C-alpha cells in the first residue's frame, strides 16, 4: 500500500482529535440549529442548556427520552470527550447513541429533537463517527430542511455517494435518486440490519414504513427488465418480508404484503415459495386491516403461478390455517363484492381443497362456483375430482346438486370428464 | 524408451489434472502443489509463478498430494514418493498390490489408505528425522467397522489419533496402539468430503445430497446441518482470517459461502469450473488471509479475494462479494496444433479440441492467455486443423492464418 | 467509617468522577429502553517437557485457543419462519420454464437453423 493510502487511514482515525486550532473550528462549526460563525461562538454549556430543556419537552411526549438524561444529557457529560475514552468505553457510548437516534427517528418533525441532537453533534461528534446511523435514521425526512443541513456538515460514507450531489445544494434530493442508493445491493443489506434493529424493538413507525414500501417496490420496478438482478434481490427483500410478518404490528405485516405482491408479478416464483408465503402471512394474521390485505395478497400470488399444479388443492396444514383465519363466510363476502380481484386460480385450488378434506363444506362449494366464474380448464379439474368423490364418498343431495349445477352450465363437458374418467 | 538425444523437461499449459491440490507455507511464502498427469508443479500464491517441478515422471499417475513445509508426499499405484523441491529423496513402497488413495501426515506419522480399506502407518526412525520412513504398523478397517474410506484426517490436539472418514460413518483410530477407540453414529447419506474445522473436535462432512455436517467428535453428536438440496459437495474449507466463513464447493461448479455466525448465505459463485469436468474439485481458504484458491478438472486454477467491507459500522453485515484476483489455466482438451511464436522462444501458440487458441509462456512466469475471438467490423470458432505464423511483420498487420474443420474459409489472427 | 450517600454525590461532582455514567452506559440494553472416546494409552503415556498425557492435552488444548480465537457459532447449536427456511435451502428462485406451458412474456428463446 502507498504511504498516502496508509496515511489517509491515519487521518480518518484522528478525525475528531482537534489537535490544533484549525481542526477545532471545523469540528465545532458543524451545527444543526445555527450557522458556522455563530456556532464557533456558542459554548458547550450554552448548547447543553438548550439541549437539556429540549429533552424535557421530548420526555413529556415520550417518557423513554428521560433515560438519556441520566446517561447522555447529564451535567457530567459536558466534561466527557470521546478522544480520551478507552476502547471498551466507546461501544457502550456508541450503543447509547444508536438507541437515541432510534427514538429521534419518529420525532424529527418536532423542533425539540433538533436541539437535543445538537448536543450529540457538538459533544460526541456523531456526524463524524456515527455518520451512517444518523443518516440512516433520517432517510424519510429527505425533503425536510433538516436532511439538507445534515448533508452539509456530514461526510458521506462510500455507500451514500449518490447524495454527494445534493451536499450544500439548493435543491433537495429528488424522488428518483434514493432508488439508485437503494438499488445498490450492499446498502440494502446495510439497511436491512437497521430495519431488523427496529423490528426487534418495535421501532417501526408509519412514516418510516411508507417510505420503505415504496422503495423496495420501486427497486423491483427499476430492475424488472434485468432478470438475474431480480434473482439476487430474492434473498434480501423476502427475508425482510418474513421479518415484517413476524412483527405483531399490523403496519409491519401490511408492509410485507405490498412487497410480496409486487415482486410476484415482477418475478414468477416456485410454488413452494408461494405456499410458504401463505403460512408466514397467516401465522401472525390478527389485525382487521391486515387480514383484508392478506386475503387480497393471497389471491394475487396464485395469479402469478403459471405451472402445473397452478390450481391444485392446498396442503392440509395450509388449508386448515386458511379456514381458521378466513371462515367460509368471509370468502363468500370476498366473492360477493363486484370489485373483487381475479382469484379464479385460488378458488379452484380452494374448492379442490374442500373436497379432499371437508365433506360438510360441499354445499358451500356450490355457492362459490355461482358467485365467481371459473376458467374452463379450472371447471374441468373441479369436475374431475368430484367424479372421484361420487365413487368414493357417499352420494349426497349437495353432491348430486354439484353435478346438476354442471348439468345446467355446459352440459356437454360434464360428459367429457365422465368419458375420460369412467 | 530412453532417447540418446532427448529427455523430458516439463509440461506446459496444464495447471491441474483434477486431483485435489495441496497447500502449504514456506516461511512467509505460500505455495500450491498441483498434479499434472505423472508430474506435479508448485506455484507461488503471491503471483502464481511456478517454483519447482518434478525431476522425473512417476511410473504411475499420482492419485493424491500432501504438502508439508519443504516436503510433498505423492502417491502413485502402491508406492508413496517423498519429494523435496521436486527432487526424489526417499520412496515408500507398500507391501500389498492395493493402490493408495488417501494420505495423511501429522507429526512423525505417515498414513496411507489403500482400496482394500487397509491403512498403512509409517513412523520416523529418529525424532529429528525429516520425513517418516520406518513402517510402524498396519490398521485395516473391515466392512462391519465401516464403509469405504472417504479420506484420512487428523484433528488438532489429538495424541496419535487418526480420524478415518468412511462413506458409512467416521472412525477414530489410535495409530500408536492400532485400536478403534470410537465409532461415530451411522449417517443416512454417503459422505464425500471431510475437512477439519479451525474449531476444536469439530470436523465438517459433505454428503452426496447437499448436506454439510459440523459433527463434533467430543460430544459424538451433530452440532449443525446446512442444506443444499439437489447438490453434491466436492470440497469444504473455513476462513481463518477472523471471520467465520465456510466455503462449500459442489460438483455442479458452484462455490457457496455461508456466514456461519449469521446462519446466512454471503454469496454464491456460479459456474467457476465446468460441471462436465467435475465442477469444483478443490477449494481451500488460505491460512490467515481472505484469499481462497479454487481448482477443477477443466485445467484451471483460480484465486478470489474478499474486499474489506465498505461500511464503517456493521462491517460483518456488508460483506463485499468475491473478486477475480489472478488465475492460471489452459486447454480443457488435448492440443491439436502447436507452434513456436518467436525466435527468442518465450511464447507458444496452441490450439485444442475445445475451440480455443491459447498462448503459453515457457518461463517461470507461467503466463497464459486466450486470444480474443471478438470480431472486427468492416460461440467459439470450429476446430483449428492447420496454422502458420510469421514474425517479419509483427505490429503492422495480421501474421497468423488458421484453417478450421468443415469450413470453407480461413481466419487471421494478430499475435 | 464509609462515606454517606450524600457525600458520594458531592464527591462525584467535585472530582469529575464519571464511573457511574459508564456503568449505566455499559448496562444500557436497547430492549429495556423500549468421553465419547476413552483411550487408556493417553492416561498412561508420559511425555517429556515429564507431564501426564491428559494434563498435557489440556495445556495443548489451552495452547490452541490462544492461537485461534473461538468463534461464536460453535457455542450455538403455521410456522412464521418458513420463508427464512426456504430461502436458505435454495439459491435458485426462478420457477423452471421447462414445466411452464406458457412461454415467457418478454424473453423469447429462439435459435437459428
Amino acid at each position: 500500500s502507498s504511504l498516502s493510502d496508509q496515511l489517509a487511514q491515519v487521518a480518518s482515525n484522528n478525525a475528531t482529535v482537534a489537535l490544533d486550532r484549525k481542526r477545532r473550528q471545523k469540528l465545532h462549526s458543524a451545527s444543526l440549529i445555527y450557522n458556522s460563525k455563530t456556532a464557533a461562538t456558542q459554548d458547550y454549556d450554552f448548547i447543553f442548556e438548550n439541549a437539556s430543556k429540549a429533552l424535557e419537552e421530548l420526555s413529556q411526549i415520550e417518557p423513554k427520552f428521560a433515560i438519556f438524561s441520566r446517561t447522555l444529557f447529564s451535567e457530567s457529560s459536558i466534561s466527557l470527550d470521546r478522544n480520551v475514552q478507552t476502547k471498551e468505553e466507546i461501544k457502550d457510548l456508541d450503543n447509547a447513541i444508536n438507541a437515541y437516534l432510534l427514538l429521534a427517528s419518529s420525532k424529527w418533525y418536532l423542533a425539540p429533537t433538533l436541539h437535543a441532537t445538537e448536543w450529540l453533534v457538538r459533544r460526541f461528534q456523531i456526524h463524524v463517527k456515527n455518520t451512517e446511523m444518523l443518516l440512516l435514521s433520517t432517510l424519510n425526512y429527505y425533503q425536510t430542511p433538516v436532511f439538507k443541513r445534515i448533508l452539509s456538515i456530514i461526510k458521506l460514507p462510500p455507500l451514500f455517494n449518490c447524495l454527494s450531489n445534493f451536499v450544500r445544494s439548493e435543491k433537495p434530493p429528488t424522488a428518483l435518486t434514493m432508488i439508485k442508493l437503494f438499488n445498490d445491493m450492499d446498502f440494502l443489506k446495510l439497511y436491512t440490519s437497521y430495519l431488523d434493529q427496529c423490528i426487534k424493538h418495535n421501532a417501526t413507525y408509519t412514516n418510516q414504513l411508507l417510505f420503505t414500501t415504496c422503495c423496495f417496490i420501486n427497486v423491483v420496478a427499476f430492475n424488472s427488465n434485468n432478470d438475474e438482478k431480480l434473482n439476487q434481490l430474492v434473498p434480501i427483500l423476502l427475508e425482510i418480508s418474513a421479518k415484517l410478518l413476524a412483527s405483531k404490528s399490523k403496519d409491519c405485516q401490511i408492509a410485507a404484503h405490498t412487497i410480496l405482491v409486487v415482486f410476484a408479478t415482477a418475478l414468477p416464483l416456485k410454488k413452494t415459495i408461494i405456499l410458504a408465503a401463505m403460512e408466514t402471512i397467516l401465522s401472525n394474521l390478527d389485525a382487521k386491516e391486515a387480514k383484508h390485505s392478506a386475503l387480497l395478497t393471497i389471491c394475487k400470488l396464485f395469479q402469478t403461478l403459471k405451472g402445473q399444479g397452478n390450481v391444485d388443492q392446498l396442503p392440509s396444514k395450509i388449508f386448515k390455517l386458511f379456514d381458521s383465519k378466513f371462515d367460509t363466510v368471509s370468502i363468500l363476502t370476498f366473492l360477493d363484492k363486484e370489485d373483487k380481484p381475479v382469484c379464479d386460480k385460488f378458488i379452484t385450488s380452494y374448492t379442490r381443497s374442500i373436497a379432499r378434506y371437508d365433506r360438510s363444506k360441499l354445499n358451500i362449494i356450490l355457492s362459490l362456483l355461482k358467485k365467481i366464474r371459473l376458467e374452463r380448464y379450472e371447471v374441468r379439474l373441479i369436475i374431475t375430482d368430484l367424479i372421484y368423490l361420487s365413487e368414493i364418498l357417499e352420494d349426497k343431495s349437495q353432491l348430486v346438486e354439484l353435478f346438476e349445477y354442471f348439468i345446467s352450465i355446459n352440459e356437454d363437458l360434464v360428459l367429457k370428464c365422465l368419458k375420460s374418467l369412467g | 524408451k530412453n532417447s540418446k538425444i532427448f529427455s523430458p523437461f516439463r509440461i506446459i499449459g496444464n495447471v491441474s489434472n483434477g486431483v485435489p491440490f495441496a497447500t502449504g507455507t514456506l516461511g512467509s511464502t505460500f505455495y500450491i502443489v498441483t498434479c499434472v498427469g505423472k508430474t506435479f508443479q508448485i506455484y507461488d500464491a503471491n503471483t502464481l509463478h511456478l517454483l519447482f517441478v518434478s525431476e522425473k515422471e512417476t511410473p504411475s499417475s499420482i492419485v493424491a498430494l500432501s504438502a508439508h513445509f519443504h516436503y510433498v508426499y505423492a502417491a502413485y499405484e502402491n508406492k508413496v514418493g517423498i519429494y523435496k523441491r521436486g527432487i526424489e529423496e526417499h520412496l515408500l513402497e507398500l507391501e500389498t498390490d492395493a493402490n493408495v488413495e488417501h494420505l495423511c501426515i501429522f507429526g512423525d506419522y505417515l498414513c496411507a489408505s489403500t482400496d482394500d480399506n487397509s491403512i498403512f502407518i509409517y513412523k520416523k526412525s529418529d525424532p529429528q528425522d525429516k520425513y517418516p520412513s520406518e513402517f510402524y504398523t498396519k490398521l485395516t478397517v473391515t466392512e462391519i467397522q465401516g464403509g469405504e474410506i472417504v479420506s484420512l484426517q487428523h484433528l488438532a490436539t489429538y495424541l496419535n489419533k487418526l480420524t478415518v472418514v468412511t462413506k458409512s460413518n467416521v472412525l477414530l483410530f489410535n495409530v500408536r496402539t492400532g485400536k478403534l477407540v470410537f465409532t461415530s453414529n451411522e449417517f443416512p447419506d454417503q459422505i464425500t468430503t471431510a475437512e477439519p474445522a479451525p474449531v476444536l473436535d469439530i470436523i465438517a462432512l459433505g454428503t452426496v445430497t447437499g448436506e454439510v455436517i459440523m459433527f463434533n467428535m467430543r460430544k459424538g453428536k451433530r452440532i449443525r446441518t446446512i442444506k443444499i438440496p439437489q447438490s453434491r459437495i466436492s470440497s469444504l474449507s473455513f476462513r481463518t482470517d477472523g471471520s467465520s466463513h465456510l466455503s462449500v464447493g459442489t460438483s455442479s461448479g458452484d462455490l457457496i459461502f455461508y456466514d456461519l455466525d449469521r446462519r446466512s448465505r454471503i454469496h454464491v459463485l456460479k459456474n467457476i469450473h465446468r460441471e462436465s469436468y467435475g465442477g469444483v474439485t478443490q477449494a481451500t481458504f488460505l491460512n490467515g488471509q481472505p484469499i481462497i484458491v479454487t481448482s477443477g478438472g477443466d485445467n484451471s486454477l483460480k484465486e478470489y479475494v474478499f474486499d474489506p467491507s465498505l461500511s464503517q459500522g456493521s462491517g460483518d453485515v456488508v460483506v463485499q462479494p468475491p473478486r477475480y484476483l489472478r488465475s492460471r489455466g489452459g486447454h480443457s482438451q488435448p492440443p491439436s496444433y502447436i507452434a513456436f511464436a518467436d525466435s527468442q522462444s518465450h511464447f507458444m501458440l496452441s490450439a485444442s479440441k475445445d475451440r480455443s487458441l491459447w498462448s503459453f509462456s515457457l518461463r517461470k512466469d507461467a503466463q497464459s492467455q486466450e486470444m480474443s475471438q471478438r470480431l472486427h467490423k468492416k460461440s467459439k470458432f470450429p476446430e483449428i486443423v492447420a496454422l502458420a505464423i510469421e514474425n517479419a511483420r509483427i505490429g503492422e498487420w495480421e501474421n497468423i492464418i488458421t484453417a478450421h474443420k468443415d469450413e470453407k474459409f480461413a481466419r487471421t489472427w494478430d499475435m | 467509617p464509609p462515606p454517606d450517600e450524600e457525600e458520594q454525590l458531592l464527591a462525584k461532582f467535585v472530582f469529575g468522577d464519571t464511573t457511574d455514567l459508564q456503568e449505566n452506559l455499559a448496562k444500557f440494553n436497547a430492549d429495556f429502553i423500549f468421553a465419547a472416546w476413552i483411550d487408556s494409552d493417553d492416561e498412561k503415556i508420559k511425555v517429556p517437557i515429564k507431564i501426564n498425557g491428559v494434563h498435557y492435552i489440556n495445556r495443548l488444548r489451552s495452547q490452541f485457543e490462544k492461537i485461534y480465537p473461538r468463534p461464536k457459532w460453535v457455542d450455538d447449536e403455521g410456522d412464521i419462519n418458513a420463508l427464512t427456511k426456504i430461502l436458505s435451502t435454495t439459491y435458485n428462485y426462478k420457477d423452471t420454464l421447462s414445466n411452464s406451458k406458457l412461454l415467457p412474456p418478454k424473453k423469447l428463446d429462439i435459435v437459428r437453423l
Binding site: 500500500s1 | 507455507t25 516461511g27 501429522f106 512423525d108 490436539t157 495424541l159 490467515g288 488471509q289 484469499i291 | -
Partner: peptide, 24 residues
C-alpha cells in the same frame, strides 16, 4: 455519481498455525 469500488491490492501476512508434532 456511481458508487466507487476500489480494487487496491492484497498482500498476505504470516499467521501462527498449530504444529502437528506436538500431536505426535
Amino acid at each position: 455519481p456511481k458508487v466507487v469500488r476500489e480494487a487496491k491490492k492484497v498482500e498476505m501476512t504470516e499467521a501462527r498455525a498449530y504444529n502437528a508434532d506436538a500431536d505426535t
